Amino acid sequence: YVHPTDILPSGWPTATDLSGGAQPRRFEGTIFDVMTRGTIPKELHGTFYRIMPDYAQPPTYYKGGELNAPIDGDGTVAAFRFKDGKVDYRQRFVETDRFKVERRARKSMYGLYRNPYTHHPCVRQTVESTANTNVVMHAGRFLAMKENGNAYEMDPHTLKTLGYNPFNLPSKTMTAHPKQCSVTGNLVGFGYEAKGLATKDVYYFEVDPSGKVVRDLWLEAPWCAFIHDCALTPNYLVLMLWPFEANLERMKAGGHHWAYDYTKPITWITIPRGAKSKDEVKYWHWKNGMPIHTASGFEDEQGRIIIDSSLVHGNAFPFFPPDSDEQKKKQEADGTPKAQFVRWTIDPRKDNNEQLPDPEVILDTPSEFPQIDNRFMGVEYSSAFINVFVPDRSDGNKNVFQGLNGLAHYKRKEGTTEWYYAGDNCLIQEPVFSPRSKDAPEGDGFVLAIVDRLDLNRSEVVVIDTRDFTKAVAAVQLPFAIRSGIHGQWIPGEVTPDFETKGLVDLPKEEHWAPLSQSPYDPDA
Ligand SMILES: COc1cc(C=O)ccc1O
Ligand SMILES: [Fe+2]
């Protein structure tokens, strides 16, 4: 009933990812010609890169790792490269300064999320990023990102780490949610806590297609807020502030970086693109809640900023609770918050001191990890591909990151939603979209996502044709499970350096090792 070796002690603390799963994976390597079921679309020409937290060492430095968060673990990138119907896989850890210290020491040397006062003395003045949140290919460079530092660059074929801060941003941080403008090609983004721990400074930038900062601006947030995501429109970058606040004194006392604050309203910072002065920036507010990710934004015909996001009516990261006893009690009392997918209207003609209108409910179901058709980034878009709790086939009492068992294809223009169910005893992660061809209509093509086959100890990539969103056309079947991850991206072959000549796996040499004379076969025999 109980295996004798299973009661042998482990030295690992519980190291969850956002799904709640706690199994360390940590493998680095490849599979050539990954097993597939069904037919891989020949139209897929590119790489699905996904990034996951997977603590490389047992994170036992601070309080035995008891307070490690699911967003903390060392970033590892899995790449699934599709070319002529074949799929290869490669996975590798980002060689962050943190990872390198810990691997070389064979020992955890970092404490609480974003709290250097809980790191090992010898590493306090390192970049503490685990580069584990998102990836982007911009100006021919492949980047792994986490918002508490600049990006690390990796080779897109070998996933070897190449360097830190490739665009030489002057801020200490860069968002893991920069947006690649479909008009200018600019990577548009920001970094908050731009001058160090608990600073209110925010740095806005646009890095052009050549890898140079062409526009930037220093500004501040109204408080030191957790600014995870943003929305790009033709004329604005819009920052989205979560109701957490940082407190240096709390950190110095060995407490968490962030504490949720029920008294903070959701706040937006509009930054006119190419603004010459921080006087052009405006703060907008609604009410308390946690809008985790934007799908995208645009400006309507009358110049209003329209942004769709998830909206959790409470704290989706309960592991960063409020400071006060009163607010802590409220978090416990609230239980699992209501979660939806909503649409915000920020009309720049209006007085920003006036509270924003209530957002419109788009999907009345827990919704997270939305993506769009990237051909429409920073302009009007219609398609969103959304990770969802499937209506009437999902728990509801699970934390928003822990019960995502379907995908939705929402089309604003048609006002339709189509649904993909991951399967019984399955979870599914964030979707990515590949257009059927360069000039396919918006949202016409293939959606890919990682499925956890929970009873099988394996992970799979499903491929869905948008012409029938309810059905997978193919599954890429790994021989094992990988961590449940955060973001991933469909990166077209056309924007990947040497995609035509380099695979994820280098071919062995042509020349035989052995001489002809060693063959068992003789054509004369
Ligand atoms: C995986 O790292 C993070 C993830 C998030 C939300 O998904 C916010 C901050 C992080 O550092
Ligand atoms: Fe994110």
Residue numbers in the entry: 24 to 548
From the paper:
The ligands are well-described by their respective electron densities. K169 also stabilizes 1 by interacting with its methoxy oxygen. Fe2+ is coordinated to H200, H251, H316, and H510 and a water molecule. The sixth coordination site is occluded by T156.
Herein, Moesziomyces aphidis DSM 70725 aromatic dioxygenase (MapADO) is characterized through X-ray crystallography, biophysical as well as biochemical assays, substrate docking and mutagenesis. MapADO features a seven-bladed β-propeller fold and a Fe2+ center coordinated by four histidine residues and shares a conserved structural motif with homologous enzymes despite low sequence identity (<38%). Similar proteins were termed aromatic dioxygenase (ADO), , apocarotenoid or alkene cleaving oxygenase (ACO). These enzymes primarily act on aromatic compounds with a hydroxy group in 4-position and use a mononuclear Fe2+ iron that is embraced by four histidines. O2 is activated by this nonheme iron and reacts with the C–C double bond of a substrate, eventually leading to C–C bond scission and two carbonyl species as the reaction products.
